[PDB]
Amino acid sequence: GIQRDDNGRRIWRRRTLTKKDDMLRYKLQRVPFVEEQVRKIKEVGKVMTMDIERLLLSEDNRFEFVNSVAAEATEYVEKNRDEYGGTKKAIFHVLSNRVNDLGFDRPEAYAESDPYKPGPGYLKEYYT
């Protein structure tokens, strides 16, 4: 398989699919009208539900997972008490860190606010 073309460069055969896979053309297509859906999913916090399901795919026992998460959150609160309880929750921080430890980027503790609040004092009125 070794062959040099007289100039020091080694010529080698590139590997190619050389076959038809009908699953390629039919599957690599994107829906164009899910901007509001994705934004609403991020706003309500379903990405954290997906993260929680993902973390349990590597756990033999879910009760052990819950106990370990609670212990880690307790350590977080004991070390830095003042940083939690408001916009940052310890359990959410633990979940985000465990997701981030896998190499998947997430906002810290899933802490988000509304950029459209019309100044201080105004509270969003939920539409039931």
Binding site: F33, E36, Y116, P118, G121, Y122, K124, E125, Y127
Partner: protein, 54 residues
């Protein structure tokens, strides 16, 4: 009907889709709401141009 020309059933929809949503805020007796408008166009018009034309 003449000259054997095949029609094309064209749908004149430069704006593919559009949505609106409302956010409400208030502190006591004074209230305030915000309008959001989403526009999807097929490239023959920008969403800002579509907003102005509408």
């Amino acid at each position: 009907f003449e000259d054997r020309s095949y029609p094309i059933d064209a749908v004149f929809m430069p704006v593919q889709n559009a949505n609106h949503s409302i956010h409400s805020y208030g502190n006591g007796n004074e209230k305030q709401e915000i309008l959001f408008i989403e526009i999807w166009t097929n490239g023959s018009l920008t969403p800002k141009e579509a907003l102005h034309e509408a």
